[PDB]
Structure 1
Amino acid sequence: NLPPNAPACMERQLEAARYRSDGALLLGASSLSGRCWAGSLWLFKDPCAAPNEGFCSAGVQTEAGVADLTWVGERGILVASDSGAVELWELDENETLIVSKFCKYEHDDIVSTVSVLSSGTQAVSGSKDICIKVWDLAQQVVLSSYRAHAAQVTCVAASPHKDSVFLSCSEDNRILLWDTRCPKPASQIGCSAPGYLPTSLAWHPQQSEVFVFGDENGTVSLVDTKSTSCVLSSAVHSQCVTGLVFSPHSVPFLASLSEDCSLAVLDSSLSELFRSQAHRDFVRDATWSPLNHSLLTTVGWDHQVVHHVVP
């Protein structure tokens, strides 16, 4: 059976996979080819059932594609749309419907990245229009609009526990550390040479002044914001690092997405522990199960919702 609103089919290009604290699975998908170029939002109470449409808890269709996604608490879904809109979708009282809370067209091009800030009341979006916008999820408005970069914004990442702090990176080769408290909020951090363009950012879940960043040449780098000169790095992928996600573990494992169609799991020294060639297309997202911390899920463009067992 398909929920009362859910479409008969889910678009081939799976962009996002987000495990809720209870264990439910959030799916973002787009139609990146064919007659219609739209998107859809899916909820799977059984993660082993995905990507099967007729076996989901809830489902809805957005007007355009889903470039990025994030959980906004337990019933909130924040969407980075191709329309240039940032969308907030509220999950039903029964959690059987996904209803549009707000659709605001503030960006002048595709919104490619979204990150919810520590409070869960504010969020930051990064667009192709080169701007970065700070949002009020309750008031449905943009508090601040920042044009700090020179090229498109690839990734925006809120700090785990600070509402004022967030990371951003762009095709202008800049990794910006933000702090809404300073009059000049951004600070251009980065190592000696410019090198290859930054593509992905992952804040450390325990060390609040540490983060990792993946480039366009498949390199993964470990960075201490204080020492401000990239000490540790490894050539993990043969193509652009699409995403970086840390495990919920006390000493977290680092999962690494790529366009080389592979997944990799790394330790503190960025050494390879696991590798999966499960995907036949681009690896788009990764979520560790809040229920089983050794379980890691992945979504790709090959419409595969793979489940991995991490040693």
Structure 2
Amino acid sequence: MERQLEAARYRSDGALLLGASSLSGRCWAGSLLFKDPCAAPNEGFCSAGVQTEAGVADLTWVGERGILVASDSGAVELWELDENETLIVSKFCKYEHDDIVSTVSVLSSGTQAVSGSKDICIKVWDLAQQVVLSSYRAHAAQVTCVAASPHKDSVFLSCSEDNRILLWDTRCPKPASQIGGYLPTSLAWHPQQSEVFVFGDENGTVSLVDTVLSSAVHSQCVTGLVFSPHSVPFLASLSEDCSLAVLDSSLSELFRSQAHRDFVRDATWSPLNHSLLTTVGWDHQVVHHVVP
């Protein structure tokens, strides 16, 4: 398997999805399922795997057998599991962006998704027809992250290196709305509250925004933010300082993990055990954390 692990996503039953890519050496490509999460990242004891043409910048589940991939090739790929879940086959590969597709997120309906890319463009996809519904050029720099609304099918967030955080609503004639520092880097909706979301910046600051509370959590760029599936959610923050932090309702630090020796790229909570949290990094480490 490739060295640099990029994404880790648990599904319903507890299977772990891994997205990796080789960011050095001769060949620059990536790879894509572990029904035994403790067996990761060993390649010999996996359920399925496949090699794509280029690297994986971001991915996300599509239901229970679909994998939506953001590729370095500028294409959005959707991979699907067979009925036996032993093979990972490509469904379509649409080269619609002109640069690296850096972020992807599935809307609420599960039939539409949004992709951002370094071509400063944001596109809305229809996973059924394999076509691009709308193409928006609202930012003036690389689109860093897009995050669909958890419960509104036409609403999603986006941030770019133009220091803009845009709230979207494709039901309006002008769908983008700018939300009022340092460049934002990761976006995460609140799972239980509608008009509440969090974001981290390149300076290691996580902030709480309503439609403002902030705390200096990390010493480097905040790479991702994932809420816990509890009733009152925890906030897991991973950054380029190679540390993992778990925050509460008031953004206070409850847990801190420095197990990783390189950048921590993703984090996923276990659906079976709500206290277990799995993180991956560019050190090829899959660490399972027991959050108190």
TM-score tier by shorter-chain length is over 0.9
Distance apart, 1:25 and its partner CA: 0.3
Q: How many residues align?
A: 291
Q: CA deviation at 1:140?
A: 0.2
Deviation, 1:169, is: 0.2
**TM-score if structure 2 supplies the norm length?**
0.99
Q: Establish whether residue 290 from structure 1 lines up as the match of residue 268 from structure 2.
A: no
Deviation at 1:146, TM superposition (A): 0.3
Paired with 2:12 and 2:218, the residues of 1 have a C-alpha distance of 30
Residue 112 of structure 1 deviates from its aligned partner by 0.4
Candidates 11, 15, 20, aligned match of 2:6: 15
Q: Distance in 2 between matches of 1:91 and 1:241?
A: 32
Q: Tell me the alpha carbon deviations over residues 86-121 of structure 1, each in whole angstroms, 9 at most, x when there is no partner.
A: 000011110000000010000000000000000100
Question: In the alignment, what sits opposite 1:227?
Answer: none
Query: What TM-score do the two structures reach when normalised by structure 1?
Result: 0.93
- Could you tell me how far apart the structure 1 residues matched to 2:139 and 2:12 are? 34
Secondary structure (helix, strand or coil) at the match of 2:44 reads helix
Q: Quote the offset at 1:211 in angstroms.
A: 0.1
The corresponding residue for 2:204 is 218
Distance 2:172 2:199 in 1: 24
Alpha-carbon separation, structure 1, partners of 2:287 and 2:102: 24
Residue 310 of structure 1: how far off its partner (Å): 0.3
Whole-Å Cα distance in 2 between the matches of residues 233 and 135 of structure 1? 33
Deviations 1:34-88 (A, max 9, x none): 00000100x0000000000000000000000000000000000000000000000
Deviations for 1:138-166, whole angstroms, at most 9, x for unmatched residues? 10000000000000000000000111000
- Using the TM superposition, give the Cα deviation of residue 20 of structure 1 relative to its aligned residue in structure 2, in angstroms: 0.4
Task: Give the deviation of 1:18 after TM superposition.
Answer: 0.3
For residues 258 and 238 of structure 2, the distance between their equivalents in structure 1, rounded to whole angstroms, comes to: 11
CA distance in 1, matches of 2:88, 2:107: 22
Following the alignment from structure 1 to structure 2, what is the Cα–Cα distance between the partners of residues 232 and 201? Answer: 15
Match of 2:191 among 202, 205, 208: 205
TM-fit CA distance, 1:299: 0.3
SS in 1 for 2:69: strand
Distance 2:15 2:147 in 1: 23
Task: Give deviations 1:158-194, integer Å, cap 9, x for gaps.
Answer: 000111000000000000000000000000002xxxx
| CA offset digits 1:258-298 (Å, max 9, x no partner) | 00000000000000000000000000000000000000000
Q: CA deviation at 1:31?
A: 0.4
Runs of 4+ in structure 1 over 3 Å off: none
CA distance in structure 2 between the aligned counterparts of 1:208 and 1:259, rounded to whole angstroms: 29
Distance between the aligned counterparts of 1:257 and 1:106, measured in 2?
30
Structure 1, unaligned runs of 5 or more: 1-9, 225-230
Distance 1:72 1:51 in 2: 22
Distance 2:144 2:244 in 1: 20
SS where residue 50 of structure 2 aligns?
strand
Separation in 1, partners of 2:89, 2:7: 19
Rounded to whole Å, the distance in 2 between the matches of 1:278 and 1:91 is: 32
Name the structure 2 match of 1:101.
91
SS in 2 for 1:243: strand
SS in 2 for 1:44: coil
Q: Percent identity?
A: 100
CA distance, structure 1, for counterparts of residue 90 and residue 225 of structure 2: 29
Q: Hey, what's the Cα distance between the residues in 2 that align with 1:264 and 1:72?
A: 27
- Counterpart CA distance in 1 for 2:82 and 2:30 is 19
* Mapped partners of 2:127, 2:194: distance in 1: 24
- TM-fit CA distance, 1:130: 0.3
